[PDB]
Paper text:
In order to investigate the molecular interactions between MtbDHFR and the PLAs, MtbDHFR was crystallized bound to NADPH and an earlier PLA-COOH compound, UCP1106. The crystals diffracted to 1.8 Å resolution and belong to the P1 space group. The complex crystallized with four molecules in the asymmetric unit, providing several independent assessments of the PLA interactions with the enzyme. It is clear that there are several strong ionic and hydrogen bonds between the inhibitor and enzyme that provide a great deal of affinity for the inhibitor. For example, the diaminopyrimidine ring hydrogen bonds with Asp 27 and a hydrogen bond with Ile 94 in the active site. The carboxylate of UCP1106 forms an ionic interaction with Arg 60. Several van der Waals interactions are also important for binding: Ile 20, Phe 31 and Ile 94 form van der Waals interactions with the diaminopyrimidine ring and the propargyl linker; Leu 50, Pro 51 and Leu 57 form van der Waals interactions with the B and C phenyl rings. The 2’-methoxy on the B-phenyl ring of UCP1106 does not appear to have optimized interactions with neighboring residues, yet the 3’-methoxy on UCP1172 and UCP1175 would be positioned to interact much more favorably with Pro 51. Although there is a notable difference with Gln 28 (Mt):Phe 31 (h), the active site residues are largely conserved in identity, conformation and position. Despite the similarity, some of the lead compounds including UCP1106, UCP1164 and UCP1172 show selectivity toward MtbDHFR (5.0, 17.6, and 5.7 fold, respectively), suggesting that the small differences that do exist can be further exploited for selectivity design.
Author numbering:
A (entry chain C), B (entry chain D), C (entry chain B), D (entry chain A): 1 to 159
Amino acid sequence: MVGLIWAQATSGVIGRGGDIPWRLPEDQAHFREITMGHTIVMGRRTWDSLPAKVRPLPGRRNVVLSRQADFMASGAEVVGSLEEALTSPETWVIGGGQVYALALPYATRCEVTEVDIGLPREAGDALAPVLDETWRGETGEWRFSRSGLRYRLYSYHRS
Amino acid sequence: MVGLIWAQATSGVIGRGGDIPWRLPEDQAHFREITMGHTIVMGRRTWDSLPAKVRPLPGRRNVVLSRQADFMASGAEVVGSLEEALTSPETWVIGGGQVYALALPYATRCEVTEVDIGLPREAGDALAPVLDETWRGETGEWRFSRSGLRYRLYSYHRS
Amino acid sequence: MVGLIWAQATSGVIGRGGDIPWRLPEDQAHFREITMGHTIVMGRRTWDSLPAKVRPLPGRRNVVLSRQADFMASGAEVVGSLEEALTSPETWVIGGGQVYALALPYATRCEVTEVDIGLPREAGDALAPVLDETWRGETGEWRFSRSGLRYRLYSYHRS
Amino acid sequence: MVGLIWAQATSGVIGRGGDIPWRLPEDQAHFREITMGHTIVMGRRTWDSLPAKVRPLPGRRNVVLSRQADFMASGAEVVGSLEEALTSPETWVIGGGQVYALALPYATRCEVTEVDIGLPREAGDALAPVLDETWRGETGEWRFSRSGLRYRLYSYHRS
Ligand SMILES: NC(=O)C1=CN([C@@H]2O[C@H](COP(=O)(O)OP(=O)(O)OC[C@H]3O[C@@H](n4cnc5c(N)ncnc54)[C@H](OP(=O)(O)O)[C@@H]3O)[C@@H](O)[C@H]2O)C=CC1
Ligand SMILES: NC(=O)C1=CN([C@@H]2O[C@H](COP(=O)(O)OP(=O)(O)OC[C@H]3O[C@@H](n4cnc5c(N)ncnc54)[C@H](OP(=O)(O)O)[C@@H]3O)[C@@H](O)[C@H]2O)C=CC1
Ligand SMILES: NC(=O)C1=CN([C@@H]2O[C@H](COP(=O)(O)OP(=O)(O)OC[C@H]3O[C@@H](n4cnc5c(N)ncnc54)[C@H](OP(=O)(O)O)[C@@H]3O)[C@@H](O)[C@H]2O)C=CC1
Ligand SMILES: NC(=O)C1=CN([C@@H]2O[C@H](COP(=O)(O)OP(=O)(O)OC[C@H]3O[C@@H](n4cnc5c(N)ncnc54)[C@H](OP(=O)(O)O)[C@@H]3O)[C@@H](O)[C@H]2O)C=CC1
Ligand SMILES: CCc1nc(N)nc(N)c1C#CCc1cc(-c2ccc(C(=O)O)cc2)ccc1OC
Ligand SMILES: CCc1nc(N)nc(N)c1C#CCc1cc(-c2ccc(C(=O)O)cc2)ccc1OC
Ligand SMILES: CCc1nc(N)nc(N)c1C#CCc1cc(-c2ccc(C(=O)O)cc2)ccc1OC
Ligand SMILES: CCc1nc(N)nc(N)c1C#CCc1cc(-c2ccc(C(=O)O)cc2)ccc1OC
């Protein structure tokens, strides 16, 4: 099973200037609970954007995709291709517009957080993958972040 | 398949003052059995620690990590990076607190010997890596050494 | 008795870019009629959106909800929690999509103005709370303002 | 009208370790049909034990009892006393041994699901209230669950 997990603004924006352009502790919680105890796969830019304190992410097998000869990622496994990255029976892809796009054909689950903020796409943004009719989903109830953000969870699957 | 194999006191101590701080022939025999005929990888200080009589370890392809590029290890292969070292399909990492920690993300097997002795950690000790919940393990029965060391075997795996 | 009072487009939009996206003096008169001489509760953003001319709103006890421990609201009562805000026996919760959603469980009345204008929801809009079957309603007759927009009043109650 | 609704093993056990110690979808459907569109009242521990996706329970006015003035229950009404909680003309008390025991004197209906499983009481279990002879009752016919659980419904009343 390969799953994708991401958080997006309604626009589809997931990253900008090497960071996630909102703060949502509830989503961090959600992400940790899905991914804990499992192999996680991320592109190297996502690895760079991890806060130093949680790089590598604790309690997970961190796998970092890089097309660069000897990229160094202390505490993670660096691999050079998707075939090498996607071999664990429960794999969560967490990381990168580029790596979402490339790994999606291998995926049978998506766990999506939608954040209800106005955030129009800009050139160079990292974007969420667009899901087609092969997928079926369930939509969760809208909620308010205990800070103020409105957000909701989606769970998609295909067989 | 990259595997780790080590022997630790209950405390996690695997090395002190450049040597293993206990005597256990049965563990030596277990180590020999697992590693014979395979590629073994060790850090440079583990190489220095090998008794001269078995440096390099016979019947194994000895691979030594150093970032001293011109380092000389007669009878072994010296490499300067982890990716250079971990390319044999059955690889056993045998050697070093540091190299265990750095190689662990690449590993899907751990073969552990626990030695039931009181040996509290001291600053500068080499330590065994701590395994998180990505692993499943089987615990062997306690037994006594050729003399009276109580010891156990563990086998850990993840996929 | 806690009540909510709001005006929405048919779409459910009540605010955009910090302002109410329509002009309707008849609604303003309805609002003052209902709230005059009572305690009103609003979120900080709604307080900020009040025209300076009527901030605080005259003839009502203005209560403002803020998570900012030090927030200043001259002429209003700043409180840090919902419990502290909803203590008056007749309380009218006035704007704020956030504060509407959070106060709704405490409420037994809703006084709603619906504005018949095409105004599709956009990301980050403030939205009216959606009312479930715990509520009973009464619908008022459609009418035109001297403006040019159709509106009508709803009155909702539960015990 | 205050009613109690609960599901119990034959032994009286309704909760253990923060959860209901069985799965019975048919009971969930039964609970939903009785409580939908009404006020529901629950102790704080029952609130915590709700699956996050149905917290608060949809289509019902959720009321949570806590001896904490501070306590926060997003999407629910937190109250500090029984008198504050039981003021709706149709109230269903849904939760927890201690709120069952405390609210029972206010109640004139009980809707009970009995689950035919061997589940002896353990210290600290949450238990169903004991019904004395003030009540009259009707017993439903035994049914097998779609999973294979044997359960039946009881309806109790007093005036
Ligand atoms: N909101 C969310 O849920 C998340 C948001 N983000 C945001 O996403 C942004 C980063 O996404 P992005 O910029 O697209 O970069 P990625 O994080 O996707 O990593 C991209 C890099 O991974 C390497 N890579 C990708 N695919 C392969 C492959 N198939 N084989 C080998 N190497 C590969 C590439 O190397 P080369 O360039 O050599 O091809 C590329 O440089 C950041 O802003 C981050 O904060 C990150 C994670 C989740
Ligand atoms: N009980 C057991 O099962 C075992 C115990 N031991 C004990 O462990 C101790 C050795 O532990 P340690 O001191 O950690 O020995 P090491 O694993 O540290 O050998 C370390 C060497 O590997 C090279 N190296 C340094 N940084 C990196 C890097 N970032 N990536 C790759 N290679 C690198 C360097 O060689 P250079 O310095 O030349 O650059 C470094 O000094 C000894 O006391 C030994 O007896 C050893 C094996 C098993
Ligand atoms: N059409 C209508 O009927 C009305 C429409 N509106 C529109 O609504 C929009 C603003 O609504 P919205 O954006 O939802 O923000 P709100 O007006 O609901 O106020 C939100 C703020 O309330 C504060 N707060 C403190 N504690 C709490 C708490 N426990 N629960 C909730 N809020 C708390 C925070 O302020 P801090 O950040 O200081 O902590 C938070 O940012 C504006 O566009 C306004 O014009 C406004 C009024 C009526
Ligand atoms: N099988 C079934 O039908 C059901 C089973 N359950 C199970 O029941 C168990 C929980 O029941 P229980 O442990 O008895 O806890 P409760 O759910 O009864 O809630 C107890 C809490 O309610 C608050 N409370 C109780 N009495 C008062 C009062 N008089 N005034 C103010 N606050 C009050 C306190 O909250 P604070 O501590 O914040 O002061 C107290 O800790 C769980 O295992 C749950 O899964 C729950 C519902 C139905
Ligand atoms: C929490 C963000 C997130 N949400 C969802 N739904 N899917 C994702 N794939 C990511 C992601 C990511 C990368 C990332 C992780 C984290 C992070 C920090 C701590 C923990 C944890 O303690 O478990 C997890 C993720 C922080 C920042 C960050 O990018 C800047
Ligand atoms: C036997 C020690 C050991 N046990 C386990 N379970 N895992 C390990 N990785 C090592 C190790 C090591 C390094 C080392 C090997 C040996 C050794 C000696 C003989 C043989 C052999 O005959 O095969 C193998 C290793 C001796 C000393 C020594 O450190 C000082
Ligand atoms: C009159 C708008 C309104 N209608 C209903 N039915 N329910 C509400 N809760 C609000 C409201 C509100 C907050 C608010 C009041 C006003 C307002 C402004 C001016 C005057 C006045 O000058 O008379 C009165 C109210 C303006 C903006 C505004 O949010 C942006
Ligand atoms: C179905 C459980 C139940 N049965 C009966 N006969 N009486 C009760 N009071 C409760 C209860 C309760 C709390 C609770 C509700 C639910 C639940 C989930 C969904 C729905 C729904 O969709 O309506 C309702 C209750 C799930 C778990 C749970 O405790 C762990």
